[PDB]
Design a protein around this ligand. Structure first.
Ligand SMILES: *[C@@H]1O[C@H](CO[C@@H]2O[C@@H](C)[C@@H](O)[C@@H](O)[C@@H]2O)[C@@H](O[C@@H]2O[C@H](CO)[C@@H](O)[C@H](O)[C@H]2NC(C)=O)[C@H](O)[C@H]1NC(C)=O
Ligand SMILES: *[C@@H]1O[C@H](CO[C@@H]2O[C@@H](C)[C@@H](O)[C@@H](O)[C@@H]2O)[C@@H](O)[C@H](O)[C@H]1NC(C)=O
Ligand SMILES: Nc1c2c(nc3ccccc13)CCCC2
Ligand SMILES: Nc1c2c(nc3ccccc13)CCCC2
Lengths: 528, 526
């Protein structure tokens, strides 16, 4: 037996596996339990640490995915299946993974912690596209990813109740981050240089760990990719959380908060998932039923409030977006859209879709959106209309939330780096009109193009290697630049770089004209 | 006696004068009385027609300027003095002018009727820059201009009262237009082809005649230059009109409407003028105390409602703006501005000026303006800020009202032509940063460059002749015609007027004017 694949952590002994890379061998420890299974009476409760075990836990394959809705819109389509669970669903799912160089490192090695996205209703650390092996081998880091509860199992909140307090999925993450502090050295990781990185809801979660003091001592640097804690989708108010938890109970035959959660706990997990989307107040895209709740505990104020009031000196942050953040979401409810035609919508469809992409606002607010995103020299051009609705959804949900976070953090002491990821993968199966859709920079950051079994080009492999260098430099030093150069983002100059097969190009403003509308004006209108 | 300079109109006999022009003689009848002098007990009342006279009235010079404020911000500066009165002030001012070719045409000739602007508080047909002689001698048309009462004397309104009903300045205009129908033939004019054209408030008045049926049988075609009846400055509501009338009264020592107007009539005209600007509710630019009031009589609804609801089939309209409508207005009250330095304002000054240029709106509305006119990659560039405040003032007060007027008329049956005038006159004395300011296309329409005594270039003279042809072509055919296409709500085509040939372009500040015409009203109701 290979001693490099035996590790003792505080709970007990683990047996790992050796994995091949086009470069060298990597050690992987998959399916390490870090919490007690949140089953039965423990559904909806904060995670409790994993009791220690005798014998040797076999950490040789991915454990199960937390219960979640499965995309069925395009059965068999690679563009959606790559995000669907690739292991059995279980509520017994709070496991984490460690990838480390082979043999295990000598000296403390810098640690990357990955938090997956998926709108807080979906995701898993087992997905192919989050494979740690390439970053570990190429950039000599230790990489940890964790599963955390999603949907109602992670974020159903009856605020004030002991029985369903909310944010427990967030607490899953924190527990994993605590686990990393106490055990990562056993694998050669340096617990004093831990960098959090995530995408979609994972980037929102990274941000929430920045703004929650108990989490803030658990890591040192942050990367937020196409997501932010201040997005209109990433948090919910106490009342709406209570209304949504309550409508779910009604939809599954339930039933006193205690009597209500008690009844929810007797229902099969899959039953809750089947009614997940029906709790939403409105037909929408880019809105999700059970997300983090602002109740004064995990988040003492709204993420936007906490950003504006924070002393962020001594923090380095890497943030960015892809070119076409909003595109794919349109085929999940915007009238006239499809992945299978050109989606050249009519003006009436555009106006309809504006209410789907910016839900729950006054008619005045909708008109203000229609005003900003219309070219009044071409009010009915279908191609321009498709592009504008994509820009509405992308600006409203990702780009302008991210721009606000970056600018406020920068103006309040943080060193910020910003990127726009502008390369469309040669392997992409979504239509060409979707551009670079939300999420399709992750495969390059994780180095997936280096897999020979996959058919990327020679330039994409080099591109992936550049990206891994940028991210790893940021982890080690707080600066993505190699020790043409990538400048910090400031509230004034608003400089960012474009990542593609061409060399770095520095540009100004993350959609500054649009994001003035969403960040500066539209809040004021909504208060009157 | 010269038989060409005697005309008989329904009131009596008139004696004219023969005028020299660079291109030949022109007959001019200047100072024809068309109403009884609105003096004494007739201050504030509708004009009453001139009663006929025996003998021969000498219509040989411009009559008096109606009582108005005189600009003193830059004493002696031609840029302001050229608009100030060039005759004595009097309430005895209701005279009009007729220019006609020499000898008088023997076939009926199409008529252009000019209404001057000046914010409804100032102006005169006497001004050099409205000299009719050049248009007449070049395009063989008959040109008429009239004086109309301005300020309180033309537009002070206590709505509902017979003693100060308001809009009497407009009725002065209407009376002159009635005069044109009964008498223009006596000079060779054709009362069946009359084209109204005006600028600033004169353009807004042209529009109000389109939207009031009694005026609408008195002309056939319309030209609106840098002004429109739907502009935020061109009308006022009944209540606000009454509030300003009443404050003006209080400020000059006057306590019953008939007793209030009675007391106002005992005040010297100059006393009224001195207190004109004090009734304005707010510090502002591009706002004027006494303007047309929407009271259901002359205007049965607001100019927007009447436009949006009107069937305009069979109407031809020529409309347009200058390049920099808003620029000069800023040195009259916007913080940091001067005609004498570059006025490279600070952002703090910019934000202040937005409240002066967009007066009487909610803080929310003010913010909506700041959003659309800030470049958020250069939020504090002084030059960009200067250019942006100019655009705020010009777009809100002129460009977008005219564009709204143009598009709605086109979409409901009218043939519309639109222009942007982009030539800065060689003679201009306003600073270079103001561009082509509001009003500095008029001299080219009237052909003033043909005056040899004035130092225009040979290219400006050719340019002036080209413009006069366009306007006169529009007057005779309804079509100014490289070809100048109709303005429509979809394609929104307009032409650029400068020393280069016609260039067709799209949209009268379409992105900005969607804000002012489509969105901002909705925001102001909630
Ligand atoms: C441009 O000038 C304005 C106006 O100042 C007037 O005109 C100048 C040419 C000069 O004659 C000044 O003395 C005049 O007062 C300047 O704005 C003024 O700033 C002063 C501060 O000293 C202030 O008291 C005034 O209220 C301001 N005037 C207005 C109308 O707001 C402006 O600073 C000058 N711009 C420059 C120098 O770049
Ligand atoms: C594009 O597709 C939209 C969705 O229609 C669905 O998908 C297409 C491919 C067809 O199979 C259709 O029958 C399905 O219901 C349409 O609503 C939209 O009109 C289409 N746009 C076009 C054809 O230009
Ligand atoms: N780009 C993404 C898509 C889906 N889920 C995702 C989850 C996380 C990050 C990107 C994603 C499901 C629908 C297909 C697109
Ligand atoms: N441009 C104009 C100015 C004034 N009056 C005007 C009147 C009509 C048209 C343009 C004008 C008086 C102030 C100086 C500028």
């Amino acid at each position: 037996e290979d001693a490099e694949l035996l590790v003792t952590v505080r709970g007990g002994r683990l047996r790992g596996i050796r994995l091949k890379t086009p470069g060298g061998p990597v050690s992987a420890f998959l399916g390490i339990p870090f919490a007690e299974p949140p089953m039965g009476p423990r559904r909806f409760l904060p995670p409790e640490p994993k009791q220690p075990w005798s014998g040797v836990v076999d950490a040789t394959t991915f454990q199960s995915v937390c219960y979640q809705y499965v995309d069925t819109l395009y059965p068999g389509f690679e563009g959606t299946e790559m995000w669907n669970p690739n292991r059995e669903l279980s509520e017994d799912c709070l496991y984490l993974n460690v990838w480390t160089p082979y043999p295990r490192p000598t000296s403390p090695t810098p640690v990357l912690v990955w938090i997956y996205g998926g709108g807080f209703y979906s995701g898993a650390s087992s997905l192919d596209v989050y494979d740690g092996r390439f970053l570990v081998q190429a950039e000599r880091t230790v990489l940890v990813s964790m599963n955390y509860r999603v949907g109602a199992f992670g974020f159903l909140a009856l605020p004030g109740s002991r029985e369903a307090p909310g944010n427990v999925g967030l607490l899953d993450q924190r527990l994993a981050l605590q686990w990393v502090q106490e055990n990562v050295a056993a694998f050669g990781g340096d617990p004093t240089s831990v960098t959090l990185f995530g995408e979609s809801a994972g980037a929102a979660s990274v941000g929430m760990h920045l703004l929650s003091p108990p989490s803030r001592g658990l890591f040192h640097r942050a990367v937020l990719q196409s997501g932010a804690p201040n997005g209109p989708w990433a948090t919910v108010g106490m009342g709406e959380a209570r209304r949504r938890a309550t409508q779910l109970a009604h939809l599954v035959g339930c039933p006193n908060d205690t009597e209500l959660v008690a009844c929810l706990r007797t229902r099969p997990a899959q039953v809750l998932v089947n009614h997940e989307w029906h709790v939403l107040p409105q037909e929408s895209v880019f809105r999700f039923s059970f997300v983090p709740v602002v109740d004064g505990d995990f988040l003492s104020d709204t993420p936007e409030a906490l950003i504006n009031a924070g002393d962020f000196h001594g923090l380095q942050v890497l943030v960015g977006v892809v070119k076409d953040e909003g595109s794919y979401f349109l085929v999940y409810g915007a009238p006239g859209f499809s992945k299978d035609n050109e989606s050249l919508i009519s003006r009436a469809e555009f106006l309809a879709g504006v209410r789907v992409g910016v839900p729950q606002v006054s008619d005045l607010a909708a008109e203000a959106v229609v005003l900003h995103y219309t070219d009044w020299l071409h009010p009915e051009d279908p191609a321009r209309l498709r592009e504008a609705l994509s820009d509405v959804v992308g600006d409203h949900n990702v780009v302008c939330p991210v721009a606000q976070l970056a600018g406020r953090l920068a103006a309040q002491g943080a060193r910020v780096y910003a990127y726009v990821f502008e390369h469309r993968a040669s392997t992409l199966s979504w239509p060409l009109w979707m551009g670079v859709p939300h999420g399709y920079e992750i495969e390059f950051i994780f180095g997936i193009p280096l897999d020979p079994s996959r058919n990327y080009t020679a330039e994409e492999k080099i591109f992936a290697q550049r990206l891994m260098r940028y991210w790893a430099n940021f982890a080690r030093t707080g600066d993505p630049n190699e020790p043409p150069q990538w400048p910090p983002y400031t509230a004034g100059a608003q400089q960012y770089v474009s990542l593609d097969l061409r060399p770095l190009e520095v540009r100004r403003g993350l959609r500054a004209q649009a994001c003035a509308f969403w960040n500066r004006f539209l809040p004021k209108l909504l208060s009157a």
